Amino acid sequence: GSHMKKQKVKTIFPHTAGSNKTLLSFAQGDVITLLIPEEKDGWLYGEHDVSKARGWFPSSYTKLLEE
Amino acid sequence: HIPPAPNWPAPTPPVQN
């Protein structure tokens, strides 16, 4: 931006853990901030803006905010 | 410290128009 310096991604569908603890849950159109300079085998690690929860999640469930 | 990754690859969104 111009008065900010934090990378983000924006979600495009909801996500759930089902049978796990280390998985970050969310909805469509949510905002998540990155915690690693690269992904791990398709999994990203991030912190949600609304929930402030952390965990692994599928990078493909999100897109670069500024397309 | 970042927690360990799972033993399987990450899933994908639905394939739609």
The count of domains in chain A is 1
CB B6 within 8 A of CB A43: yes
* Tokens found for residue A61: 């469930």
Helix/strand/coil percent split, chain B, to 5: 0, 0, 100
Nearest to A42 by CA among A22, A59, A26, A62: A59
Of B5, B10, B14, the CB nearest to A58: B10
Instruction: Say which residue the tokens 């992904």 belong to.
Output: A39
CB A43 within 8 A of CB A59: yes
Domain region containing A32:
1-67
A56 and B6 within 8 Å at the Cβ level: the answer is yes
| Residue B4: closest C-alpha in chain A | A22
Question: A7: domain CATH number?
Answer: 2.30.30.40
CB A21 within 8 A of CB A40: no
Q: Which amino acid is at B8?
A: W
Q: Give the integer Cα–Cα distance in Å for A15 and B17.
A: 20
Q: Give the integer Cα–Cα distance in Å for A11 and A7.
A: 14
